[PDB]
């Protein structure tokens, strides 16, 4: 048995049921064998009918096509950042401030 894995619709796989499509929130997604995490939004890209998914300058998947409806979805990571704690000495006080 030889399996073909390309940038194709890939319409041969096991009996996994699909769920509804929810947008504008960080969720776990499995778009036709492609797993990931993030928020999916409506995309304004000019995809061509033979194209399936997009890519960015950082060479990662940032756009997908719904295998049920001809809709392009942009994938972005959910919110992220760094946290800094501002304190005087513990010999002085136990109060702190937080910088996001």
């Amino acid at each position: 048995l030889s399996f073909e894995l390309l940038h194709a619709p890939a319409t041969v796989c096991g009996p996994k049921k699909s769920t509804n499509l929810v947008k504008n929130k960080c969720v776990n997604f499995n778009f036709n064998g492609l797993k990931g995490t993030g928020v999916l939004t409506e995309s304004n890209k000019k995809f061509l009918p033979f194209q399936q998914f997009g890519r960015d300058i950082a060479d990662t998947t940032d756009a997908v096509r719904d295998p049920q409806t001809l809709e392009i979805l942009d994938i972005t990571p959910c919110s992220f950042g760094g946290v800094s704690v501002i304190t005087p000495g513990t010999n002085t006080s136990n109060q702190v401030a937080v910088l996001y």
Partner: protein
Amino acid sequence: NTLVKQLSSKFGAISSVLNDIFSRLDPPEAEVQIDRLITGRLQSLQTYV
């Protein structure tokens, strides 16, 4: 830019995507594949520093 572009190198593994390796193959070989990728990326970070 070089640091960002160094993320598409397979470093001798089957793929550069962690999810594909974890979903397409068993843990016994996933260990070595992810080890190769992690070592490559750590080397890139150390070189940048």
